[PDB]
Amino acid sequence: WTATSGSCKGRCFELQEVGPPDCRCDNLCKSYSSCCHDFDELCLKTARGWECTKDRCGEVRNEENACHCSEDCLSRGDCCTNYQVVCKGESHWVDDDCEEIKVPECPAGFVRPPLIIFSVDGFRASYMKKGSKVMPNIEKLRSCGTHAPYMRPVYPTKTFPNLYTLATGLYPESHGIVGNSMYDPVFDASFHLRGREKFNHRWWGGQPLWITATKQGVRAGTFFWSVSIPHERRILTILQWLSLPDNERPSVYAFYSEQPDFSGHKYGPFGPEMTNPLREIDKTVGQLMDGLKQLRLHRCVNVIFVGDHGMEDVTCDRTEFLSNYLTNVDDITLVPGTLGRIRAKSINNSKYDPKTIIAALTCKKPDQHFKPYMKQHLPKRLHYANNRRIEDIHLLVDRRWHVARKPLDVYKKCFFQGDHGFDNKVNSMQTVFVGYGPTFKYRTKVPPFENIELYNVMCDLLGLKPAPNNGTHGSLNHLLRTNTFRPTMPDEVSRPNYPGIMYLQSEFDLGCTCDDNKLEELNKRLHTKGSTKERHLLYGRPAVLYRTSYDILYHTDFESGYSEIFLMPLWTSYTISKQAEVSSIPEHLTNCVRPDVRVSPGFSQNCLAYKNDKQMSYGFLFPPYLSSSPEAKYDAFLVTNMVPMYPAFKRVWAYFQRVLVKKYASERNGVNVISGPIFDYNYDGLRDTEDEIKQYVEGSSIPVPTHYYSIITSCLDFTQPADKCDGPLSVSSFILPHRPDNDESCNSSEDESKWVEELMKMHTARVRDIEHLTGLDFYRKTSRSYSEILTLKTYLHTYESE
Ligand SMILES: *[C@@H]1O[C@H](CO)[C@@H](O[C@@H]2O[C@H](CO)[C@@H](O[C@@H]3O[C@H](CO[C@H]4O[C@H](CO)[C@@H](O)[C@H](O[C@H]5O[C@H](CO)[C@@H](O)[C@H](O)[C@@H]5O[C@H]5O[C@H](CO)[C@@H](O)[C@H](O)[C@@H]5O)[C@@H]4O)[C@@H](O)[C@H](O[C@H]4O[C@H](CO)[C@@H](O)[C@H](O)[C@@H]4O[C@H]4O[C@H](CO)[C@@H](O)[C@H](O)[C@@H]4O)[C@@H]3O)[C@H](O)[C@H]2NC(C)=O)[C@H](O)[C@H]1NC(C)=O
Ligand SMILES: Clc1ccc2c(-c3cnc(OC4CCOCC4)c(C4CC4)c3)n[nH]c2n1
Ligand SMILES: [Ca+2]
Ligand SMILES: [Cl-]
Ligand SMILES: [K+]
Ligand code: NA
Ligand SMILES: [Zn+2]
């Protein structure tokens, strides 16, 4: 109940919200049906429109007007945005040359430059170039400020997940808004776009920017606008808030536009009807900037122009129907559209089986436009699993397609021509970023980056300490003129042991077998003391950031950090020059495994466990194919270089090591490779402790990895070889799921040259994703600045075209 018989007199767009049943006068009251009776009349004036005209100049203040052209309007802070232009001979902000803003030029009483976040729904990244003729204000922001060619949204590329990621720095799995539609089994409640439940605070985790600001004594403008409040009135409200006295004036403001997304759904991303919505967004930007100039704030405010996701062409006829795959289509609930989430219709139904649902949806049709996954098997780069709100069964839908349960669902819900929600690597889902202001750089282009990074930067801009989040603070320092955040490398927690030769061959009973001079004896010894280490370990050894017991092991061709707890390397490092040659495993060595005389039998794997385990085989981290000499090849068969691998996965791994590593070394002028195992049994994206491991090689304590990673580094200037690089680095990485079958690749019964690289590209990763998953910190010793290394660690190689 609201006693809607209070009044909004002097309260229009009040900054603190009042508690029911007192009536509300804030920018959200409409959405709760709780505005006072007189809100429309007092707070939403429209008389005479939004612009001054010649004849309105110097008028007598008429308080009924939407905005004013009278003499006192400036000191009142309520002129139409074009007042100085029409009535004072001033130019529009867009018609002024840009001039570097070296320092904030702010009115007395401002303690920090304000921040205005201008967010645009469905603003696809290519609109910046393709709509540039009809967006002169936006284009001036872009070319004068700091801009990226595009910004990567989070998955799913829906509106609420992305806006809340912008506000918090968190993946949807951590903030809790994991789609536009959700069921939470603990609350037994549902969350929907339409309606009441979405206003309940228990949906919204982490700490959004407005709460971070408030807690630290920075005042925030209310960020959200009821849909019926027109854009002109939102701008005028922000500009009025900017005229408040110093003790009441917010320091951060948000404007939100429902366009161009609204029209993109109806007409497709490039429908000829899309020109008008883009013109209108630009007109609104122009109104803001003209209004800031009038208040002498246009060289004082930092403005962020940011999208939530792009838009793709999608029509009704590109719909796959689960009823064409499943016989039991009625025993399931599907969350449909550009992603699929499947659960049982009834938890009382004990004959529902996710296993058989997945199998019935797997590679069933020659051009099938979606792929089913258990959520823990989704590419780790999506960070889309660790939430009770995310259903165990997920469908990744091809760009341009929809998935629905039954055909009745589509024609009884062609309406739409655009949609979004797909994999966040898809070009059409990319969105925009432009920063303009004293704290941003002047005329600077920065590389594409992920929207999870912006919360830290907005905190920096406001002098706030960010709540814990998924950004990597410092990775966007290159956007900023000042206010940079100077991070330190994390401290190593465990230092390694460097074992020498301590065991005789005969002490090992591992059931392993192998068919195996003063000039060359001095050689082997030096190699084992780390003589070639500067060749194979180019950026220092990775730091171990948790408490554990491990050994550094040196060899001619590679170096490893061997874990006595997990019985295998945490990491193996080697360099393959452009000239390197691929050999094969000689026949006498096909099944050779050799004890490592530096490592006790008790901390070694054993061959017997593999013989016994009919499901599990083994592979090697440093590949025998890339040995530098027949003598060095024996090192590759050490029991300490061995890892557990399903035969189905060995097909993948063998092709990567035999063909692809050499291919990248040719193409990139040498590569440094670091590979290792990952254990993430609870799919939280974080290194498992040993008591979290759910699977072991049968009869033994050898833990089975959930994934294998590799980080492949070279010189960005590929005229210099990877091992002699004078400047910036270039990286690509991956985190391959370690699976007992290749069901994920529909073409797997073909030659590895037809499917393996495609699989690896799907599982592309950031070095930072590998760091969370292993508790290691890479690139500890380079000649580059730490900020630059942080940027490199957040890089994702996406394999999309331009
Ligand atoms: C992305 O960045 C984020 C932010 O840094 C990272 O997530 C953090 O990870 C931390 C490490 O795992 C985690 O720490 C835990 O916090 C527990 C306290 O949790 C509450 O308090 C915080 C702080 O205010 C709050 O943010 C939390 O909010 C969560 O929960 C509610 C709903 O339940 C949501 O509204 C909200 O969205 C958020 O949900 C998300 O996080 C939880 C995990 O906490 C997930 O389960 C959800 O799916 C969702 O993703 C909470 O209200 C604390 O209790 C934990 O302590 C246990 O573990 C420690 C280890 O030190 C152990 O020593 C203790 O004994 C204790 O164990 C006890 O509980 C166990 C479980 O019941 C039990 O088995 C034991 O026997 C013990 O009884 C733990 O320290 C932190 O909460 C989150 N923060 C957020 C915001 O998500 C994230 O890791 C990053 N991702 C990547 C890939 O890097
Ligand atoms: Cl239909 C619809 C959908 C969303 C909105 C919003 C809306 C606007 N800004 C938001 O966050 C800002 C965080 C800082 O960075 C910029 C975005 C949020 C997040 C809470 C989800 C929602 N206002 N009106 C709406 N109407
Ligand atoms: Ca884990
Ligand atoms: Cl959704
Ligand atoms: K076996
Ligand atoms: Na297959
Ligand atoms: Zn939309």
Which residue among 174, 203, 204, 456 has the greatest number of ligand 1 atoms within 8 angstroms of its CB, and so is best to mutate? Answer: 174
CB 792 within 8 A of CB 727: no
Nearest Cα residue to 330 out of 322, 338, 341, 339: 322
CA of 21: how far to CAs of 36, 197, 320, 325, 664, in Å? 11, 19, 48, 52, 67
Q: How far is CA 16 from CA 26, 27, 34, 235, 381, in A?
A: 8, 10, 15, 19, 39
- Nearest-angstrom CA–CA distance, 102 and 438: 6
Dist CA 338 CA 128 (whole Å): 25
Q: Which among 651, 648, 647, 675 is positioned nearest to 661, based on CA atoms? A: 675
Residue 70 contacts residue 63 (beta carbons within 8 Å) = no
Q: In the Cβ-directed half-sphere of 50, how many Cα atoms lie within 13 Å? A: 17
> Binding site for Ca(2+): which residues?
680, 682, 684, 686, 688
Give the separation between CA 383 and CA 402, rounded to whole angstroms: 22
Report the distance separating Cα 285 and Cα 264, nearest Å: 20
Give the integer Cα–Cα distance in Å for 139 and 128. Answer: 7
Between CA 321 and CA 461 the distance in angstroms is 48
Cβ of 170 less than 6 Å from ligand 1? yes
Handedness of CA 78, 80, 86, 90 (dihedral sign): positive
Nearest to 643 by CA among 548, 587, 710, 586: 710
Active site residue 159: yes
What resolution in angstroms, rounded to 1 decimal? 1.9
| 224 Cβ below 6 A of ligand 2 | yes
Listed residue (545, 773, 770, 801) closest to 673, CA to CA: 770
CB 322 within 8 A of CB 129: no
What residues are designated binding site?
Answer: 121, 159, 180, 261, 265, 308-309, 420, 680, 682, 684, 686, 688
The C-alpha atoms of residue 94 and residue 100 are separated, in whole angstroms, by: 15
CA 716/CA 722 separation, integer angstroms:
9
Amino acid at 488: T
Pocket test for ligand 2, best of 166, 170, 181, 224 (most atoms within 8 A of CB): 224
Question: Does 470 sit in the ligand 1 pocket, CB within 6 Å?
Answer: yes
Residues 6+ apart with CB under 8 A from 590: none
690-697, long-range: CB < 8 A, 24+ apart: 690/565, 690/566, 697/605, 697/609, 697/610, 697/613, 697/616, 697/644
Q: Are 679 and 708 in contact (CB under 8 A)?
A: no
Q: Give the active site residue among 81, 157, 159, 640.
A: 159
In this structure, whether the domain defined by 505-794 belongs to CATH 3.40.605.10 is answered with no
CA distance 534 to 523: 16
Between the CA of 368 and the centroid of ligand 6 the distance, in Å, is 13
d(Cα 371, Cα 363) in Å, to the nearest integer? 8
Q: What is the 3-state secondary structure (H, E, C) of 51-114?
A: CCCHHHCCCCCCCCECCECCCCHHHHCCECCCHHHHHHCCCCHHHCCCCCCCCCCCCCCCCCCC
- Give the C-alpha distances (Å, rounded to integers) separating 518 from 555, 557, 580: 19, 21, 27
What whole-number distance in Å separates Cα of residue 666 and Cα of residue 332?
Answer: 50
Going by the annotation, the residues of the binding site for 1-tetradecanoyl-sn-glycerol 3-phosphate are 159, 180, 261, 420
